């Protein structure tokens, strides 16, 4: 089975940078692509970002492109979001998430692909971020 | 820009009802959408992708009807396990957006 | 008797028409450019200190063989130095493209290949910018592109370590020899000679290519000037030569990115990225009046042979012949030229495309990919001839023919001859 | 390094008188590329460079007049290669002519040289035998 | 009168420093060695040595163009002798290694399984091999599927096991026209006057080995161990000691590994260690203690000569390579501690050491190479002959890596390049008639 | 091989019974960058010798180790003595020393031998 | 004496063996061939064989330095000649096989049908080709899933259909300051002193025929049979003949076969056999008895005056390359029988026997090559002019060979590289003046 | 040269008969193995023509193909006189005899000729 944690949530001030990991406690991390999701206390959940398994293919939600920062670690199966410039309507419940492991297309010599299929997989627990 | 919805906002139903709830799309989506239920208290589980293929742990009470872009989740049986939030997403293409949410109360 | 006995003389004026290598002299950062001082030999930019008087000697340039061994010569340089970097036989794959579309231009296509990442188990879909130029269909439904190439040969990426810029070269004959310079002025090529001198290397010869015109090229003293094997047959190139140079400018105004690719393992592929800024089609300048003076001056001596003179576009070929292609700030261009000589006897523009894979030589069993240079492109220089040819109500248009005519532009003047320094004589000296 | 010495010539083009007195001219008061034209080309014109100037210093090494510049001999002219007078062909000719008119017989007079030269060195030799 | 009138001689023994290219002279299964007949005169004599008397000259081996000249040479035909061996891309795949686990449970090393393009170029196999953990490096925390150590940057070929790794000697030879003097002195400096010189047509036989902060097999000093150094007070600059006295080391690998042949492709191989046969212990050197004792003694003995309390200092951190004894012995790379030896101031002593198959071996980064296992038992004798030393500015001294030239130099201080000019002018009172 | 070098710190007096040929004088595999350096460098050597070779010839001194000259001695080049030059001085500081005029040195023997040809040439001519 | 003098005579004639570089002459001359005999040095105008009349002098052909540089000088003509040529490393794939038939049974061959990538790398396609028994193997004893031979040692260059192989005069020049000295006894066995001797600037016409058990195409000795040996008594020397009358032969491949252009990769094209025309029959050789009948007998008489009744019989056994008889005709290479031809003890006799595309030509077995088949019928007419033989040491003997260097010792046993030596010194009643 | 050999086994005398002179000393690509092997051979053929003529040049006898020297024969070279040779034998024999002392004679021609210079100029410095 796969499991995940997060930590460094908590209360700071606007225009910070208050920054979000998540841990992968499982095998095979290095063909898992990740996703982060926020969720404001009674509203539907919300895209952020996404990284590919090689972290080639980033991508975020254009409510927060050019502030937020995803990146990852194989060596030490993290993901961690360098987010900055926060400001208090990113108030919300986070969770990293990753999207299936990449499909298999077997056909000359072995094929692990890329995609960001955006499925999200398993969710970890979850921690929280807010702003006042 | 793929706007997504889903109605009703909440339905009532008890154990052993059959359950159905339904999520449109503005813009056409082959197969790629899915489900998620989120028991309160505990991040969401993933329960149907590519509109008809269940998920690894899910018991299969589930099933939803990828055709179209109507698409809709069933239930045969309601369960207290299954009494809970629910989540469709299309997986089409990017940027991914989640509809409002639809949730189950006791009839 | 006379009374008369051989008499030997060691340093006499004689010479004997010879064929021979010659070698290389330039004027003065590592591994810089094609053209390497550092495999050329510098030897001396100023040899000069030459001069004669009452000589007469014959030339014929157009079977001056010096150009022949230095033809192949250059080529020979040219597919030497392309050795050490990569071969792009991975970027041979089937590549799905959709419209550059906004963010609405045309002639690029955003086209996406798979390739392999660092390790063969895992691979990664990337995305580029490709000219229609480089691509040909394989699909009539308007998708699954191929690479223009890729059923002649493996092309080589111009890595950028090494750059095509030209440097002057100096031609220099090896001990034992000399080049005559012939130095008139109207001096057309073949026959004899009259005024003319000698020199150990030629003068800085610009290794230029380009077709239907000649750029930073030589200049004949005063009044334009015309060479040709025959003027009665029209097999042949005619080629001609400005005294009064035209500027023409050129430029890409377009702030156009670099995109690496780890294409191969320790190899970086390179491809166009986004552009930045306005979007234009790259255009050339040449000004009316300053442009249309010259062609007055060349149908003087065109009638001086015969006995009205029209110029017209192109006469026909593929479009690697039927234009203006050249070399400008790294990025190969192949324009049109049907702007100017469209006449009978404020800029006047050339639209044209880019081209990255080129071939130039007739030669197709080698490739040449020029990546990108990113941000906008500009670039003037002097134009000094034309390369027409005879239609045959006489018309004439612009003709490319074989590269190697571009050469004799440069060394019409220059013929390499031996020395015979050993002369005898009868004399009434004796030895005692 | 097998200078060509005289080799852009002074005033080619007069009459043959010039080269007794023009020859006064003075004489001297890298890694290269391996793989290219530039290495191998530039490498032969040199060898066959040297070739030529030690070819030349052969024939003067059996005209015997090596060490010198210009030097008379003993074989008497042939009148079979031409009849010129003196001021038909030293005052009134260039060089280049004089050698695009005899070059049919040059070779002959070469040869004529070399058997001279050695029969001269070897009757002097039977001298010194004495 | 004086009478004096110019005089040419040709042949007058007068020479000028001067640089040029000196062609190899080497001592005597196709294409044998690393130094056959690709690039040097096969099997030349030790020819003899000219003597020369009240003679004077000023060498610098630091400005010596002979060390800088021998350096591209080195790296241009260790390029040309791995030009024809297989380029090692295809063994770039994810590998299933796991704990070695197998017992005749040892440390340092994997057991790897991974995919292979067979002969064919269709069908995968399951092939497997040993690697050491120097050269592979995990993807996950969890440890498993592992990956080399060099695929990201640059794929590199393997060494073909038929050409011999063995540092045979040569001798450099000059072009005629030019001299190679040889300087003499029992003591000598690196650099300013000689009064004591010779001259030779070929050098005299260097072993190039290659090693990091400990000279093998070198040449020596007559006696009293010699220091030598661009400025002793400057520090960055690099301190080579050549001993006078050799201390023995003996280096071995008491394992029987075997040889794997994987057919990596078509008509392509890439061997890799196989089952291990035998006890089972790590590798390491023997170098006596007394002797290295006395010879670390001596040199702390002359290196305060310029000191006016002298520390030996362990290596300087970082990298594995440059931190550590790094030389070849007679087909696998060797790294080895020497942080028991530079732990000193004023019987046995073992170093234990590491082998790594996937290598640089210069500080130019350009270049890379597999190095196939030697089937069996190895062990290689050699002599310590120099040391190179670091310094900060009561010194620590640490044992030296900096740059390569710096073995070379080692071996050609004595030796300066000079061009003949035999011709000679000068008054006399003869007069040409 | 008897003196190839051996007479160079000997003074000059000495050293000029002992010029001994100071100059002096299988196949190399083709692709090799040594190939072709070492077949340039001996190429090098030719050019060095006949260098030398030439410019005997043209001095007249053709196939002699020593040879006199026409012109005299100038004190403004160096005001050493017979005993100062051959018994105390060596080779090499002549050539220290000399250096800066060696030019008007090769000059003077350049014309003189010249000039005195074309006078030889005119006693021929007789 | 009268005190006699030493003197110097330049020019003497006299000379000393030598090892040298000699270089390429051939006459003037077409075409482009594997040879670089790009006009070598143009052939010698009207020969200049001057004889050296009443000189003793000797012939080692065993000894002799010419050959052995020169058969390491040829194999580089090939490699040199053939490294722009596609290798055919993509091919090497898995081929389905079923038995050959076509209308009129023919057998070693299958029609194969394989996957081989188009003109893109990432694209396959189905193809299908004919294929020569000897030259294909089964990946396993099912039946079928065959493979190409080389794929398991090493994938192997086609040779490019634009560059033809044809043998061509070569003249092998001595250089300036050499000379090539000639042998012309009648009876000359090889070894030991010629009574007349002369010599020439180049040797006459060889030509690079590559053979088996027989030459072809040879130098024919002017008269009478010879049998040349590094020594009779051991069996371990190969047994040249040289034939006086050259019996002719006949070879030919009858099927009008076609060439079928395959495309493998960006720039590659590869060649193999496809539909035939015609009809089915056997390719053989085509020797008449009588002429053959003859010579055997004949070469029997000279071989037994070593022996005071002699016995011929068929190869002994080893790889193709030397059991049977290789040589070339028209682009393809055959191996032919032979077993009738030495049928006898002491018209025309028809050799059935076979092609194949894949060659090693050498003893360099990591080399190879592959032939792409020649449109059209086929057809040479040759001469023979030697037998490599072996004796098992009444006498038998067989064909032998192995090596392929004695081809070039039937031609070269004629000729020894000389240095000119122009200076002697001799007393003489001269005192220089 | 090829013919210049013809002499061959005509006695010593006849090397002054028939005269003539030894080999005296088309472009081809330039990586082909026998550009290199021409190219290779040809400075090897040029090393092989200097040094027989410095010879000449160090011994006093360049430009001369005979000349004769100022040193003695010895016995132990040889006690054949000039009537036992030169009507009896040839030059290949005789320099297949004498080569172990050929060393010895070619030094003693270089000083003994070199101190003839010595001695012309000290002659001359009179
Ligand atoms: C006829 O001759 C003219 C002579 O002027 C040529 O035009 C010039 O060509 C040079 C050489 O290519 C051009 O130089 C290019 O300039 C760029 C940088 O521009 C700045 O610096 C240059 C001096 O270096 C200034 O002249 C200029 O005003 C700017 O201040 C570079 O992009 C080019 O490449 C260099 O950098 C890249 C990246 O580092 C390297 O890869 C290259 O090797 C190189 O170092 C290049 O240097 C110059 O701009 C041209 N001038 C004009 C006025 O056009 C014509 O090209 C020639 N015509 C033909 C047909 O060949
Ligand atoms: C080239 O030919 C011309 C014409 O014959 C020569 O003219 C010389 O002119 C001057 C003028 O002062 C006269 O004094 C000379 O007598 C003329 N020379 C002769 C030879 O007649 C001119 O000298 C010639 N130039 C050369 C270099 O030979
Ligand atoms: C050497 O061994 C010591 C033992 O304490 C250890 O600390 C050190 O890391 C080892 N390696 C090096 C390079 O010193
Ligand atoms: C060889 O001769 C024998 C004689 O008995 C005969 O049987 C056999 O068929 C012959 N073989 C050939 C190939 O001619």
Redesign the interface.
């Known amino acids: 089975e796969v499991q995940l944690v997060e930590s460094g949530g908590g209360l700071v001030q606007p225009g910070g940078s208050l920054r979000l990991s998540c841990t ?1 406690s ?6 898992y692509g990740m996703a982060w999701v926020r969720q404001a206390p009674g509203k ?4 952020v970002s ?1 990284i590919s398994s ?1 972290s ?2 980033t ?4 409510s927060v492109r050019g502030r937020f920062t995803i990146s990852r670690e ?5 993901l961690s979001l360098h987010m900055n410039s926060l400001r208090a309507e990113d108030t919300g419940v986070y ?1 990293c998430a990753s999207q ?1 492991p ?1 499909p298999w297309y077997e056909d ?7 995609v ?11 921690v929280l971020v807010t702003v006042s | 820009d793929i706007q997504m919805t889903q109605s009703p906002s909440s339905l009532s139903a008890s154990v052993g009802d059959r359950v159905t709830i339904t999520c449109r799309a503005s813009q056409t989506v082959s197969s790629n959408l899915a489900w998620y239920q989120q028991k309160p208290g505990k991040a969401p589980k993933f329960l149907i992708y590519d509109s008809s293929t269940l998920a690894t742990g899910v018991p299969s009470r589930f099933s939803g009807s990828g055709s179209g872009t109507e698409f809709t989740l069933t239930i045969s049986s309601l369960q207290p396990e299954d009494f809970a939030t629910y989540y469709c997403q299309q997986h089409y293409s990017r940027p991914v957006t989640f509809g409002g949410g639809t949730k189950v109360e006791i009839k | 008797a006379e009374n008369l006995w051989v008499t030997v003389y060691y340093g006499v004026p004689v010479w004997r028409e010879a064929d021979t290598t010659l070698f290389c002299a330039s004027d003065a950062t590592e591994a810089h450019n094609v053209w390497a001082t550092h495999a050329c030999v510098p030897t001396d930019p100023n040899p000069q200190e030459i001069y004669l008087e009452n000589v007469t000697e014959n030339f014929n340039m157009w079977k001056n063989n010096m150009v022949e061994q230095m033809h192949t010569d250059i080529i020979s340089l040219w597919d030497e130095s392309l050795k050490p970097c990569v071969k792009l036989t991975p970027l041979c794959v089937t590549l799905d493209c959709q419209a550059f579309n906004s963010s609405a231009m045309q002639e690029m296509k955003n086209c996406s290949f798979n390739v392999t990442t660092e390790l063969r188990d895992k691979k990664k879909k990337e995305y580029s910018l490709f000219y229609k130029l480089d691509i040909v269909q394989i699909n009539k439904n308007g998708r699954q592109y191929r690479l223009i190439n890729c059923n002649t040969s493996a092309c080589t990426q111009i890595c950028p370590k090494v750059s095509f810029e030209p440097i002057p070269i100096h031609f220099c004959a090896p001990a034992g020899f000399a080049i005559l310079k012939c130095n008139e002025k109207h001096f057309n090529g073949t026959g004899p000679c009259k005024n003319v001198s000698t020199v150990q290397c030629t003068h800085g010869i610009k290794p230029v290519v380009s077709t239907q015109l000649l750029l930073n090229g030589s200049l004949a003293e005063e009044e334009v000037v015309i060479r040709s094997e025959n003027i009665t047959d029209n097999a042949k190139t005619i080629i001609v030569q400005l005294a009064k140079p035209v500027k023409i400018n050129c430029t890409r105004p377009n702030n156009m990115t670099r995109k690496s690719i780890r294409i191969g393992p320790g190899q970086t592929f390179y491809a166009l990225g986004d552009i930045i800024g306005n979007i234009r089609k790259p255009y050339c300048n040449v000004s009316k009046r300053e442009w249309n003076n010259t062609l007055q001056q060349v149908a003087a001596q065109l009638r001086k042979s015969f006995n009205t003179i029209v110029f017209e576009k192109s006469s026909g070929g593929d479009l690697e012949v039927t234009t203006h292609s050249f070399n400008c700030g790294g990025e190969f261009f192949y324009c049109n030229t049907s702007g100017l000589f469209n006449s009978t006897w404020d800029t006047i523009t050339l639209q044209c495309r880019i081209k990255q894979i080129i071939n130039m030589w007739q030669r197709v069993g080698r490739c040449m990919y020029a990546p990108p240079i990113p941000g906008v492109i500009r670039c003037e220089s002097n134009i000094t001839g034309l390369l027409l040819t005879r239609d045959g109500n006489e018309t004439f248009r612009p003709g490319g023919g074989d590269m190697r005519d571009n050469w004799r532009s440069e060394l019409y003047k220059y013929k390499v001859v031996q020395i015979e320094p050993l002369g005898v004589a009868p004399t009434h000296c004796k030895r005692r | 390094l097998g200078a060509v010495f005289f080799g852009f010539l002074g005033a080619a083009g007069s009459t043959m008188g010039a080269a007794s007195n023009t020859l006064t001219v003075q004489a001297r008061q890298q890694q290269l590329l391996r793989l290219g034209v530039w290495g191998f080309k530039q490498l032969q014109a040199r060898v066959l460079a040297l070739e030529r100037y030690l070819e030349v210093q052969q024939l003067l090494g059996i005209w015997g007049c090596s060490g010198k510049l210009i030097c008379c001999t003993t074989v008497p002219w042939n009148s079979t290669w031409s009849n010129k007078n003196y001021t038909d062909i030293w005052d009134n000719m260039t060089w280049l002519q004089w050698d695009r008119e005899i070059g049919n017989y040059t070779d002959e007079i070469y040869r004529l040289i070399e058997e001279s030269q050695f029969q001269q060195e070897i009757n002097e030799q039977d001298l010194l035998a004495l």
């Open positions: 992968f499982g095998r095979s991390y290095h063909n539907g959940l919300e895209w996404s090689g080639s293919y991508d975020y939600i254009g194989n060596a030490m199966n993290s969770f299936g990449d000359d010599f072995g094929y692990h692909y890329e960001l299929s955006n499925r999200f997989d398993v969710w970890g627990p979850g």
